[PDB]
Amino acid sequence: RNLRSMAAQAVEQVVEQGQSLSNILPPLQQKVSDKDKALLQELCFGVLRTLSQLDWLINKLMARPMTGKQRTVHYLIMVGLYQLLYTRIPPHAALAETVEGAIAIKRPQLKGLINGVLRQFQRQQEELLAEFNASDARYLHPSWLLKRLQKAYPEQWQSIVEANNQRPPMWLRINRTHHSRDSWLALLDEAGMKGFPHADYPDAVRLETPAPVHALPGFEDGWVTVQDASAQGCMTWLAPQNGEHILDLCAAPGGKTTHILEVAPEAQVVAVDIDEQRLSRVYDNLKRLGMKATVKQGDGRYPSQWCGEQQFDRILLDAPCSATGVIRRHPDIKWLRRDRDIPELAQLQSEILDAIWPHLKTGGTLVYATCSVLPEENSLQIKAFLQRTADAELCETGTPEQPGKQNLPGAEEGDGFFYAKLIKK
Ligand SMILES: C[S@@+](CC[C@H](N)C(=O)[O-])C[C@H]1O[C@@H](n2cnc3c(N)ncnc32)[C@H](O)[C@@H]1O
């Protein structure tokens, strides 16, 4: 089977149809050898990551880019450009496989057009490249987002986008009930693998080289979970304790749900999420780590539908969000989001905060988190909420003037992420 046609179908779905790479790649990958699986992954992620340069190049190379009925050829050709640009696959091999992929995309008569464009690029790669990197297009971010980050981070926007464009680090979370972080790293090293601690995330290990989970010591025994570091940080602020009734809202796939139970094995946890599909992963992680929790489907806007009149001791709200902090792991976010999404998501976050607040007990604690770097979903959001909510007080994260704590992505850091901790005095 042709991997280049599999990547071109994978990707075109994402950009033109708005499907997530997460719903696509899984099945595709089940169909090929291990080395084929890694290369397919590299092609899909890579093309998504650079979808901008591959656009700015096509345009310099084709007076008329392939549209309408021959749009996949647009994507196949991009898959070819990615290979000529960002790998050291023998170019005759990248050309050959890309061209031959025209038969799996049912357009064998464009073999010449595909060869022709790719060869011209090898021919014009140079002038097209440079002119590209002269453009603001080099940051690989759509203008709307690039402009929001320059407004929010006048001094750091560039470091932000450079971090978004790096290959993501594989961060692991060591289950403290079975090992100390340090005891497990010792296992890691005996298995020929290298990881690094982080002072700010005591359960975390950053692997030098990403690995399959079947290669992580005790994964299937629940000694370790793949969880980005900033997300691990939520426990610092949630500070959960045994005996407590803890609501983990928007819980799937259950990274934080299980983290709470590693911190407080005897907490009574109720995990809810509006999506029955993703809810399934909570149980899976639940079982894998030999834990129990109450798992319920429900909408964080309309809580009484699922908890009637119940109040909780602590609430973790891992709010639905633009995901701008995690672009380095999901490059498709840059093409599926739109500038309009931001105020819509801020409104949904604002409503959930308003609907759940009354379910929190006086003296109780609520931690609001997002994987966004946009102020509207984060400090502003928390700013507004306190203003209109007289019985809420801010705790240790940020100030009444700049509420919460904003993480920004980096090679030895967690993802762009945001925390705000609140208490019901
Ligand atoms: C940031 S993700 C969850 C990550 C999870 N907390 C973990 O730590 O693995 C947000 C989740 O919110 C769910 N969600 C979206 N809208 C919701 C709503 N109105 N009510 C409850 N959950 C919602 C989504 O299905 C998604 O699973």
Judge if the beta carbon of residue 299 lies within 6 A of ligand 1: yes
- Pair (208, 73) in one structural domain: no
Judge if the beta carbon of residue 16 lies within 6 A of ligand 1: no
- Pair (89, 179) in one structural domain: no
Alpha helices in 233-303 (DSSP H): 234-238, 255-263, 276-288
Q: What is the CATH number of the domain that holds 43?
A: 1.10.940.10
Greatest alpha-carbon pair distance for the chain in Å reads: 71
Query: What's the total number of domains in the chain?
Result: 4
- Pair (236, 385) in one structural domain: yes
**Atom of ligand 1 at shortest range from CA of 253:** 9
Which residue matches tokens 């890691």?
188
- Pair (183, 269) in one structural domain: no
**One-character DSSP codes across 158-170:** HHHHHHHHSPPP-
- Pair (209, 120) in one structural domain: no
Distance (Å) from CA 87 to ligand 1 centroid: 36
Q: Which residues participate in the annotated binding site for S-adenosyl-L-methionine?
A: 250-256, 273, 299, 318
Give resolution, Å, one decimal: 2.1
**Cβ contacts of residue 300 below 8 Å, gap of 6+?**
249, 250, 272, 274, 317, 352, 355, 356
Beta bridge partners of 423: 365, 393
**Cβ contacts of residue 259 below 8 Å, gap of 6+?**
173, 203, 225, 227, 232, 234, 235
Question: Computed over its alpha carbons, how large is the radius of gyration of the chain?
Answer: 23
CA distances from 144 to 133, 334, 336 (A): 19, 10, 12
Judge if the beta carbon of residue 10 lies within 6 A of ligand 1: no
**Atom of ligand 1 at shortest range from CA of 321:** 1
- Do 21 and 332 form a contact (C-beta atoms < 8 A)? yes
**Atom of ligand 1 at shortest range from CA of 234:** 8
Which residue matches tokens 């097209």?
128
- Pair (245, 386) in one structural domain: yes
Q: What is the DSSP secondary structure assignment for residue 317, as one 8-state letter?
A: E
Query: How far, rounded to the nearest angstrom, does the alpha carbon of residue 42 sit from its chain's CA centroid?
Result: 16
- Do 7 and 43 form a contact (C-beta atoms < 8 A)? yes
**Atom of ligand 1 at shortest range from CA of 273:** 22
Judge if the beta carbon of residue 305 lies within 6 A of ligand 1: no
Q: What is the CATH number of the domain that holds 148?
A: 1.10.287.730
- Pair (151, 132) in one structural domain: no
Backbone angles phi, psi at 171, to 5 degrees: -90, 140
Judge if the beta carbon of residue 325 lies within 6 A of ligand 1: no
- Selection from 240, 210, 214 nearest residue 228 by Cα: 210
Mutate to test the pocket of ligand 1, among 250, 263, 269, 370 (most ligand atoms within 8 A of CB): 250
Q: What is the CATH number of the domain that holds 181?
A: 3.30.70.1170
How do 268-273 and 294-297 pair as beta strands? parallel
Closest residue by Cα to atom 10, ligand 1, is 320
Alpha-carbon dihedral 379, 382, 384, 390, rounded to 10 degrees: -150
Helix (H, G, I), strand (E, B), or coil: what is residue 240? coil
Judge if the beta carbon of residue 355 lies within 6 A of ligand 1: no
Mutate to test the pocket of ligand 1, among 247, 273, 283 (most ligand atoms within 8 A of CB): 273
- Pair (46, 149) in one structural domain: no
Judge if the beta carbon of residue 273 lies within 6 A of ligand 1: yes
How far is 159 from 92, CA to CA, in rounded Å? Answer: 36
Q: Which residues participate in the annotated binding site?
A: 250-256, 273, 299, 318
Note if 371 is an active site residue: yes
Judge if the beta carbon of residue 303 lies within 6 A of ligand 1: no
Beta bridge partners of 205: 172
- Pair (221, 231) in one structural domain: no
**Atom of ligand 1 at shortest range from CA of 231:** 8
**Which domain range does residue 195 map to?**
169-226
Mutual angle of helices 34-49 and 21-29, in 10-degree steps: 160
CA distances from 278 to 186, 234, 297, 322 (A): 34, 21, 10, 18
Q: What is the CATH number of the domain that holds 391?
A: 3.40.50.150
Which residue matches tokens 């119940």?
310
- Pair (71, 196) in one structural domain: no
Q: Which of 307, 321, 371, 395 is catalytic?
A: 371
Distance (Å) from CA 250 to ligand 1 centroid: 3
- Selection from 87, 16, 94, 88 nearest residue 55 by Cα: 16
- Pair (269, 181) in one structural domain: no
Domain-ending residue, one of 209, 226, 243: 226
- Do 396 and 371 form a contact (C-beta atoms < 8 A)? no
Distance (Å) from CA 279 to ligand 1 centroid: 9
Judge if the beta carbon of residue 414 lies within 6 A of ligand 1: no
Closest residue by Cα to atom 12, ligand 1, is 250
- Pair (190, 94) in one structural domain: no
CA end-to-end distance (rounded Å), the chain: 62
